[PDB]
Amino acid sequence: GIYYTPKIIVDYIVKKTLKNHDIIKNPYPRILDISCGCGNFLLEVYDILYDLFEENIYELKKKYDENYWTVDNIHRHILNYCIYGADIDEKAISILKDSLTNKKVDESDIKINLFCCDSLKKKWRYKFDYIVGNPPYIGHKKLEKKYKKFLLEKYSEVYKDKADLYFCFYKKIIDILKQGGIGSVITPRYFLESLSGKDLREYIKSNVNVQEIVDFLGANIFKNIGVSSCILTFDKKKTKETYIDVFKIKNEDICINKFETLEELLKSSKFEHFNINQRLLSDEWILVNKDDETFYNKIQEKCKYSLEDIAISFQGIITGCDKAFILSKDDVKLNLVDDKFLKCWIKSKNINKYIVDKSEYRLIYSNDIDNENTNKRILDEIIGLYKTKLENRRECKSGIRKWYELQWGREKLFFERKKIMYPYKSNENRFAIDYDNNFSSADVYSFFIKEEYLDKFSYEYLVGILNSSVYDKYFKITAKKMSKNIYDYYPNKVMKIRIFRDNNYEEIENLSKQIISILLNKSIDKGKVEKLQIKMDNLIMDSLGI
DNA sequence: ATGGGACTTTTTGA
DNA sequence: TTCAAAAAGTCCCA
Ligand SMILES: OC[C@H]1O[C@@H](n2cnc3c(NCCCc4ccc(O)cc4)ncnc32)[C@H](O)[C@@H]1O
Ligand SMILES: [K+]
Ligand SMILES: [K+]
């Protein structure tokens, strides 16, 4: 329930917000953490504030009440007017109160601005100069549905559909930041590209100036946590600048403690830096260097079609309980199942470039079982072994599905045809032509070509360009980075891939047919396939003028 | 034990 | 009626 932010990142975020504060002009800064926990950020804020006041104590004494501004009074002043925290966990608040009280070694009742509450519901009675911290991340499966009602009603500007709780914390932080204030947080990176983050990105862009984005990509910032992180720093300062510093990591294998500070890491060869004009951000944030932007714009301008224009996309089967319906093709229980009910079944690891592995699994398409008396053996001995769990699926509880039916069986005829399949998460482009009427779960996506576009594009040509090094780089420019060496390959981005057709079409298609032919024979030569791929990459680069 | 690698279900809002 | 998105992933080992 409580996650420990690495100290190097905590110090960086606090320094980012407070390093240029003019304590003489404003000796009453309000610094807030609305998910403060045990005080990872607030205790560091205390240290930064204490040095800031002590360094200028005589200037404050001369300018202001000379009896109020003494070194002995800094501790009381910081806790009365400067440090604010909120968290739902009262045990964490109690520990943090002890820590803040123990910074100075009662006199009279020092009051500490710590609130045990839901930060998304609190009536915040003033705004803040500086806001730092690490909000909770809770996705759509793990968030309580009753709470989702409240979020959908009151945070609809950033929270719909499959959005995340931390979207709302971005909203709350922005709303209670003072004019001219600065905020700096570490959150998941996914909202930068994800479809769910579209409204949140619009909210950030139009309400704050984004100073800086640190993107750690798939690096493991939180030990033993499967999440990918970024640091955002933003302000509400009236400026004409509108330019963002982007620091994007180059090696995801780095360990965060290479230097004493994060700034040393950011300036090093481990990161690349570039600038993005916030005014030029569309609903998508394309955060790339000038070389990649030129590369991306060339391809976009050259291609007159998208996959969406020419193809029909669909997600795979969702049985709702795979162990009930998926069997090994050598399982003796398949003797009980008439072959009309059986489909070939593949996983994402079975998709290679250009062709699919031979399937080892079979799907019982139980939707075609008419009733429980004709095929009782299949229900009693195979599917019924998981009947309790099958009955807890949403559509079974509501009576839409029989307990033995697939939850989302889709349309059989979409799968039983020539089509292209690709894994939903992969390190690289792997688009394959399926010749074997393979079915799959939602870890594999499929598309087929519209009939009116068959004379312009063939499957062989499509897998040729889509598997090229050019298109691998092109897709990853805007793709959603999930974890180390993993991108989402989902239709909401895959179908936006733009394609071209020019004088090189026939030779690209012929090279693709050679590759497929080699990949499908027995005494397979790996090597010549690579040479043919290099030749095709040259044709594609020639076509797109790169 | 931890940190790194292989691999990916079904719940859920719309 | 029925689509497709979602990693504080999950799980294993040396
Ligand atoms: O995880 C990092 C830190 O964030 C703290 N924190 C988590 N959620 C909140 C919150 N509102 C959101 C409430 C979400 C919720 C709703 C219903 C329910 O049944 C259970 C939870 N407001 C303030 N602090 C919060 C957390 O204690 C921890 O120290
Ligand atoms: K004075
Ligand atoms: K990661």
Automatic annotation (TrEMBL):
Domain annotation TaqI-like C-terminal specificity: ranges: 347-496
Pfam families linked to this entry: Eco57I, TaqI_C
Gene Ontology molecular function: any one: DNA binding
Keyword Chaperone attached: no
Highest taxon, organism lineage: Bacteria
Domain Type II methyltransferase M.TaqI-like: 82-222
EC number: 2.1.1.72
InterPro entries: DNA_methylase_N6_adenine_CS, MethylTrfase_TaqI-like_dom, N4_N6_ade-DNA_methylase, SAM-dependent_MTases_sf, TaqI_C
Keywords, comma-separated and alphabetical: DNA-binding, Hydrolase, Methyltransferase, Restriction system, S-adenosyl-L-methionine, Transferase
GO annotation (BP), single: methylation
Reactions listed under catalytic activity: a 2'-deoxyadenosine in DNA + S-adenosyl-L-methionine = an N(6)-methyl-2'-deoxyadenosine in DNA + S-adenosyl-L-homocysteine + H(+)
Name listed for the protein in its UniProt record: site-specific DNA-methyltransferase (adenine-specific)
UniProt organism field: Clostridioides difficile
